[PDB]
């Protein structure tokens, strides 16, 4: 790379970075890891 461009995050650019959608507030299970 030769340059780094910084701008505002588009609603389509944020979904382009993410491969999936998270719906659960709990991080992991309480019983097992």
């Amino acid at each position: 790379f030769d340059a780094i461009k910084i701008a505002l995050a588009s609603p389509d650019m944020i979904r382009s970075w993410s491969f999936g959608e998270v719906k659960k507030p709990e991080t992991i299970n309480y019983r097992t890891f």
Binding site: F1, D2, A3, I6, A7, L8, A9, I14, W17
Partner: protein, 1230 residues
């Protein structure tokens, strides 16, 4: 006249002036502050009863049920002191309170407080940690000022701070606009009208209370003003003031002070005044017309020609207004009345609510200052509230009353105009001490109001059918509020207990850090410096320089904590120029008023001063006063020094720049396995060991029957007994807090009688009651072929041979088994149980405790490299290793109780059966389930020790601050050697004395050369086996030198076998005590050098080691006291090539336990790019840490033999790339 433990190693005091008062209890700010906290006193001033009587009785809102309180009781703890230091259980007895349910009593237990041992510390989680005192801001009125260029902008500023014990801070700050603004909790500043209008005060009631009132009278002219005799001081007017045809004040000219006294004899209450002088003033009074009732003028408005014409049609002859002046009465209060938006009472409370209804705004200000639960002032908080305002009494209510706000505003105008002085925060009277029992009173009261809000909600749904007090109060917030303060908090400091000097100085440590005090990194510059009011109370020497200097400072030897909290030191009262035997504790406020003379003054047999003009101080600065004008005198020469600074000899000869560095390193000396006494010390050295709890101090005196290193018994005498004998279990080779050994060796022989104040067994780094922080080596202040470019130390091989500085470090390797104890991995150090046995010589990198996971993979722990040594004991508690301690403590209980009962035998069946049931009572307290962390079944702790051998890299220094490390292990043949043959043990750089005024380390070296030379002659007279009477005359002649020694011992009182055993401790050298400012002079050491075979000169000629030639310049050899520090090279060396990386970012770890990845830092990137090291800086932050795809390709390249670096994408920047991409900011690479 001397004790039994002092006859073996009697030490000569070199003090010219005798100490008329002995040293008090060093832990008086810790024990006696906490001793009043435990017992149930009837008064509620000091102790836990102040916390109970303030909360109780708990009365619910319309619940018609009250919770009455009568008494509280502390039972015995479930474990002793020795069990909590290895297990992890908090040393805390159950605290039970009797609570009465009235419109039914039970001694209900709510929470546990950590009890204080004889050492003065607490055991929370198996470690010895003690809360420390606080040099915070005292509750009361504080007048501050910031002159110069700090927030001045060309004008002086005066801010008045009223701070409580707890609640909301109240501040009254000025401005460059000259308007008093009130500040609450450092928020947006409000005008000073609405803070006075909230006290049910009208507009006219503010001006007459803060200003003077002048009377006016209407006549045939326009208006007349009554002259006030207290208003002409500093009054410049362009017109002339006349009175009945007599001209007193000239028009357009500044009058002198002659017209003030001339006007006082002819007081006239009426003069003539023009109409333009009154128009510049304010009226400050509302008036109501009699015809229609309309307001003529508003409140606080300036007069004019039209407003003065309305006074004739109104009909009032008397006009009540003020007088403006620039030096007498500041008009800044009247100018604030045009700044505030509102002037009503109800509309001012809603501004405090914004600081918006009417009921919530009224109840907020009543709960801010007028209520006793939120705002509170104790007897010390009202003492400073009354002393700063010059009130009559000192006792008062905790709330801010209606008359207390107007009294601080009168004093604010006095310090503005110059009538009153401004206070300072560095004054010791302005620094209250939140001690051990004072902070435990408040933090238990934090839990007492967390359960007060719990019962205010539970009593609403209660049926009140004679409810039990157990389910009313809950045990969770009362116990956790004490454990959060005594555990993870700013005041619960990690007490370092490698040597007993650090055990005592941590008790006498005054740390301003905390929730009530200011922190270290954000402190101002003025609080770090020492004020001249630190004389006798707080030492200026013991401050841990670095990030926190000035906030943490040690308390002095004779300083005591008052019941209020202010610091006092005892002074000798001088009556008619004669000092008396009694003492008087005076605080820092009474120090400035009294004329207290200095201790360093020659006194006669009666008590008079030999000089007409003696040195003295009044406000702390140096001055000169007579012997009759002084009021008090310092009781001893150890006033301004602490217990850590007093052990440094010749502190008058030592620099204050280096003694600040000297006593900080003295609080971290490691205990040597052989304790050699200081050859040059202080009389305080005998007092640190007898006051420390880690050194075994006998409670009852008498002869001994069985002296062992495990335990010592003492046959109690007929007068000391009340029966039986006492036992003292000595802690042998236990783990301290800093991974350092603690062992208690005995010092008395068999059949040796001791008194109550004597020592039966010296602690770690102690011998025969004298604190031995290090060892006296033959220090030669000379360079030797290098190795002394700086203040580092060149040491002998003799020091390595005879173990003169090798210490023991006992490290803890805990094993969390969430996980079987069996060591079935998919050795010789195990006893077929998975646990290492006692005494195995382990090596760094083997298995220690086997712990496999149920799946079978091995995920157990191992010993790190560099700490290879033997194991002291493996404490297994909650399977074959667990029952070994359970039978060892059973045999220890069968050795403690069987020895107790067999003494009183030489009826009998009842006295034998009562110890059998006490054995099973001690058995039940051991085999029971220990309280551990939830989730595990048992935890095993390995007390792994390692003999830290002296080597190049160990930090060693004296008590004066000769900071350095060991250069190399220089052999005994290479060191310089005197004419008698003995080589030096330490070769030291003599180039510190040009840098700092460190001649006191040479006064110790010259006195150590004299003390060893006398001890060499005693060793010479013992090898030749001379007479006992001729040996007595040499010791009697040796203890008689000096001008006027305060001991004046007599060897004729010592027995023939007593003086023969005296020379055994005198064989290694002569113990010599010298005070810090009443020390030996330059002529007294040269006179002491005339006694020995060595000459009078401090430097003597000697040959070189590797050369064999005599020096043309003689060097100063001697037995200077040196001590090994805690910073050792075995623990402060960490090397990592590859290891485990961090999980947040792909980077190495910190600490030697985490394999030791060295952090570069932002300061070292700029030093690397300064030379132009582009290929090295690109390696230093990518190949080492960031390039995960690169550091494995590099690790396959170095083992191949090719030193080639590839350019890669750093993943540490990809850590940064995801952090910005996790926000709403787009960032990409091109």
């Amino acid at each position: 006249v001397y004790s039994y433990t002092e006859k073996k190693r009697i030490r000569k005091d070199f003090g010219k002036r005798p100490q008329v008062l002995d040293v008090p209890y060093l832990l008086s700010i810790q024990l006696d502050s906490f001793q009043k906290f435990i017992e149930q006193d009837p008064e509620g001033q000091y102790g836990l009863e102040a916390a109970f009587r303030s909360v109780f009785p708990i009365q619910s809102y319309s619940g018609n049920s009250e919770l009455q309180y009568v008494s509280y009781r502390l039972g015995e703890p479930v474990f002793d002191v020795q069990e909590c230091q290895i297990r992890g259980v908090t040393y805390s007895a159950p605290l039970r309170v009797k609570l009465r349910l009235v419109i039914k009593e039970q001694e209900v237990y709510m929470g546990e407080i950590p009890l204080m041992t004889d050492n003065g510390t607490f055991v929370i989680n198996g470690t010895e940690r003690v809360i420390v005192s606080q040099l915070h801001r005292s509750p009361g009125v504080f007048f501050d000022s910031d002159k110069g260029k700090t927030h001045s902008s060309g004008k002086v500023l005066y801010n008045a701070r009223i701070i409580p014990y707890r609640g909301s801070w109240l501040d009254f700050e000025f401005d460059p606009k000259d308007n008093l603004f009130v500040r609450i909790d450092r928020r947006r500043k409000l005008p000073a009208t609405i803070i006075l209008r909230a006290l049910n005060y009208t507009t006219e009631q503010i001006l007459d209370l803060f200003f003077e009132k002048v009377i006016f009278e209407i006549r045939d002219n326009k208006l007349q003003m009554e002259l006030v005799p207290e208003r002409l001081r500093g009054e410049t007017a362009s017109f002339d003031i006349e009175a009945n045809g007599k001209v007193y004040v000239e028009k357009g000219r500044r009058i002198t002070a002659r017209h003030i006294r001339q006007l006082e004899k002819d007081d006239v209450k009426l003069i003539e005044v023009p109409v333009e002088y009154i128009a510049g003033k304010v009226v400050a009074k509302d008036y109501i017309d009699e015809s229609t009732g309309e307001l003529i003028c508003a409140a606080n408005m300036e007069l004019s020609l039209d407003l003065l014409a309305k006074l004739s049609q109104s009909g009032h002859k008397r006009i009540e207004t003020l007088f403006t002046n620039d030096l007498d009465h500041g008009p800044y209060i009247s100018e604030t009345l045009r700044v505030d938006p509102t002037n009503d009472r109800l509309s001012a409370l809603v501004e405090i609510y914004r600081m918006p209804t009417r009921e919530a705004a009224e109840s907020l200000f009543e709960n801010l200052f007028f209520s006793e639960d939120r705002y509170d002032l104790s007897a010390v908080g009202r003492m400073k509230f009354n002393r700063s305002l010059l009130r009559e009494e000192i006792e008062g209510s905790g709330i801010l009353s209606k008359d207390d706000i107007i009294d601080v505003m009168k004093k604010l105008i006095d310090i503005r105009n110059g009538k009153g002085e401004v206070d300072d925060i560095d004054h010791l009277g302005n620094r209250r001490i939140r001690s051990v029992g004072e902070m435990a009173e408040n933090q238990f009261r934090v839990g007492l109001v967390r359960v007060e809000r719990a019962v205010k909600e539970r009593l609403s749904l209660g049926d009140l059918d004679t409810l039990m007090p157990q389910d009313m109060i809950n045990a969770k917030p009362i116990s956790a509020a004490v454990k959060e303060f005594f555990g993870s908090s700013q005041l619960s400091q990690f007490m370092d207990q490698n040597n007993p000097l650090s055990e005592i100085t941590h008790k006498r440590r005054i740390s301003a850090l905390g929730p009530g005090g200011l922190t270290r990194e954000r402190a101002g510059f003025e609080v770090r410096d020492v004020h001249p009011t630190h004389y006798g109370r707080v030492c200026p020497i013991e401050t841990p320089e670095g990030p926190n200097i000035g906030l943490i400072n040690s308390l002095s030897v004779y300083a005591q904590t008052n019941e209020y909290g202010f610091l006092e030191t005892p002074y000798r009262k001088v009556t008619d120029g004669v000092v008396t035997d009694e003492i008087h504790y005076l605080s820092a406020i009474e120090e400035g008023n009294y004329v207290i003379a200095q201790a360093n003054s020659n006194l006669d047999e009666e008590g008079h001063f030999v000089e007409d003009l003696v040195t003295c101080r009044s406000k702390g600065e140096s001055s000169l006063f007579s012997r009759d004008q002084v009021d008090y005198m310092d009781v001893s020469t150890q006033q301004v020094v602490s217990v850590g600074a007093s052990l440094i000899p010749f502190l008058e000869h030592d620099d204050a720049n280096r003694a600040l560095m000297g006593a900080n390193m003295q609080r971290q000396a490691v205990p040597t396995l052989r304790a050699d006494k200081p050859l040059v010390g202080t009389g305080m050295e005998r007092a640190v060991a007898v006051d420390s709890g880690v050194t075994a101090v006998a409670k009852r005196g008498g002869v001994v029957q069985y002296v062992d290193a495990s335990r010592i018994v003492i046959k109690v005498n007929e007068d000391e007994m009340y029966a039986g004998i006492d036992i003292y279990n000595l802690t042998k080779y236990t783990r301290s807090n800093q991974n350092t050994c603690i062992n208690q060796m005995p010092c008395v022989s068999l059949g040796e009688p001791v008194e109550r104040g004597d020592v039966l067994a010296d602690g770690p780094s102690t011998d025969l009651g004298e604190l031995a922080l290090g060892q006296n080596m033959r220090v030669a202040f000379m360079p030797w072929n290098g190795y002394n470019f700086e203040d580092s130390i060149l040491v002998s091989e003799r020091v390595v041979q005879e173990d003169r500085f090798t210490t023991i470090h006992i490290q803890e390797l805990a094993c969390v088994s969430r996980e079987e104890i069996t060591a079935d991995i998919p050795l010789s150090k195990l006893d077929e149980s998975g646990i290492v046995y006692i005494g195995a010589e382990v090596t760094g990198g083997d298995i220690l405790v086997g712990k496999v996971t149920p799946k079978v993979k091995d995920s157990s722990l191992r010993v790190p490299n560099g700490v290879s040594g033997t194991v002291i004991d493996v404490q297994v508690f909650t399977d074959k290793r667990a029952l070994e301690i359970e039978e060892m403590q059973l045999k220890q209980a069968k050795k403690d109780l069987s020895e107790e009962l067999q003494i009183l035998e030489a009826q009998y069946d009842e006295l034998k059966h009562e110890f059998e049931k006490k054995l099973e009572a001690k058995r039940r307290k051991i085999t029971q389930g220990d309280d551990l962390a939830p989730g595990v079944l048992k935890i095993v702790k390995v007390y792994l020790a390692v003999k830290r051998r002296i080597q190049p890299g160990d930090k060693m220094a004296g008590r004066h601050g000769n900071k350095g490390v060991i250069s190399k292990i220089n052999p005994i043949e290479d060191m310089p050697y005197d004419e008698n043959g003995t080589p030096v043990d330490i070769v030291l750089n003599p180039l510190g004395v040009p840098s700092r005024m460190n001649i006191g380390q040479i006064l110790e070296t010259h006195l150590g050369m004299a003390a060893k030379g006398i001890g060499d002659k005693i060793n010479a007279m013992l090898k030749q086996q001379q007479e006992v009477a001729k040996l007595r005359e040499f010791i009697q002649r040796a203890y008689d030198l000096g001008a006027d020694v305060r001991q004046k011992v007599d060897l004729s009182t010592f027995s023939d076998e007593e003086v023969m055993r005296l020379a055994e401790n005198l064989r290694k050298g002569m113990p010599i005590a010298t005070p810090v400012f009443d020390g030996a002079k330059e002529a007294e050491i040269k006179e002491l050098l005339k006694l020995g075979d060595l000459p009078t000169s401090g430097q003597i000629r000697l040959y070189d080691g590797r050369t064999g030639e005599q020096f043309e310049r003689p060097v100063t050899v001697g037995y200077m006291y040196m001590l090994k520090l805690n910073h050792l090279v075995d623990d402060k060396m960490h090397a990592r090539s590859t290891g485990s990386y961090s999980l947040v970012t792909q980077q190495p770890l910190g600490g030697k336990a985490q394999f030791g990845g060295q952090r570069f830092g932002e300061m070292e990137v700029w030093a690397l790019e300064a030379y132009g090291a582009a290929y090295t800086l690109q390696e230093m932050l990518t190949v080492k840490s960031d390039d995960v795809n690169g550091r494995t390709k590099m690790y396959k390249n170095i083992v191949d033999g090719n030193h080639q670096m590839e350019p890669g994408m750093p993943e540490s920047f990809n850590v940064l790339l995801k952090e910005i991409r996790s926000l709403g900011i787009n960032i990409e690479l091109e």
